[PDB]
Design a protein around this ligand. Structure first.
Ligand SMILES: C[C@@]1(O)OC[C@H](O)C1(O)O
Length: 316
């Protein structure tokens, strides 16, 4: 019969992380004979994503995979989708667990929070330090889950560190650069910026270069292709991510499994070419209390620390 149709929705288009995730989703679609539509708003917003969800539902799509800008903002549209039998998955940034079926997740908040703090500590290497957090928004699901854990870890394991500020760049290159320059100017006693956002990290690096700020540890999460110039110049020594192309791929393979009615309750696994096995984990892995039939989290097998040694191995 007519080929299945899956939508893959980023927080916004035109950012390398999301372009690369979309590439993985679309290549998986080709391998599986599924038509995958990559579409998102030009900036992150609830209305941008909600219209797309509603459009794809109204147009008869079989599954929608979305990286949510908000835990709650998409819920009415996603609940309508699920009421109509459209498979709903999140990837990257979750909604509330009751607003989707599966979350294709790069890592637990404990894992990702730990990565951020470990990267910072490796470079700071002193007990008394001043650190700034810098990411997209105070409401986005993923980054706030990770930052809560990173801040807890700092308070426990680095008691001499002071978090002097937490500011936001809203996935906007212009606003992010201005915010980063503002942090560096306002806090001359600053030892690290921790920037778990694909736009905030290069903005912080660029701000440090613009202001000729030296010996500032700048760590966070972004893509190798975006970060490579900053790593080459030495402004960023280390940052983290994961294979976002593979994440997009996994999301489409999981959606395919749902469309084929394969067993995907907590504990079940799924074979994916070039990856091996992925498994459905409980929602409690993300800190949620919610369990239901046909609902859980699929964790990526690995995350990656990038530095000068390995950055040229990766093209995304
Ligand atoms: C990489 C990241 O931190 O920046 C944009 C994404 O939503 C992300 O995973 O949060």
């Amino acid at each position: 019969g007519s080929a299945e149709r899956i939508a893959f929705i980023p927080k916004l288009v035109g950012v390398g992380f999301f372009t690369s995730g979309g590439n993985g989703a679309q290549e998986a679609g080709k391998a599986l004979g599924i038509d995958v539509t990559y579409d998102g708003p030009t900036e992150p917003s609830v209305s941008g994503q909600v219209q797309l969800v509603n459009n794809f539902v109204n147009q008869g799509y079989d599954a929608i995979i979305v990286s949510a800008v908000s835990p709650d903002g998409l819920c009415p549209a996603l609940k309508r989708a699920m009421q109509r039998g459209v498979k709903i998955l999140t990837w990257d940034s979750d909604t509330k667990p009751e607003c989707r079926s599966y979350y294709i997740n790069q890592g637990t908040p404990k894992q990702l929070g730990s990565m951020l703090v470990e990267m910072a500590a490796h470079q700071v290497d002193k007990e008394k330090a001043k650190v700034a957090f810098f990411y997209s928004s105070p409401t986005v699901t993923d980054q706030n889950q990770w930052v809560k854990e990173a801040k807890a870890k700092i308070s426990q394991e680095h008691p001499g560190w002071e978090i002097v500020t937490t500011q936001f760049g809203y996935n906007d290159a212009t606003k992010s650069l201005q915010t980063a320059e503002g942090i560096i100017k306002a806090y001359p006693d600053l030892d690290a910026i921790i920037a778990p956002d694909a736009n905030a990290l290069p903005a912080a690096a660029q701000a440090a270069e613009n202001l000729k700020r030296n010996n500032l540890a700048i760590v966070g999460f972004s893509t190798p292709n975006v970060m490579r110039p900053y790593v080459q110049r030495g402004t960023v020594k280390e940052f983290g991510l994961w294979d976002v192309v593979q994440q997009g791929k996994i999301s489409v393979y999981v959606a395919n499994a749902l469309l084929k009615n394969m067993p995907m309750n907590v504990g079940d696994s799924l074979d994916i070419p070039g990856i091996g096995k992925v498994t459905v984990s409980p929602n409690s892995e993300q800190g949620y209390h919610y369990e239901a039939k046909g609902n859980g989290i699929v964790l990526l097998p690995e995350r990656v620390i990038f530095n000068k040694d390995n950055i040229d191995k990766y093209d995304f």
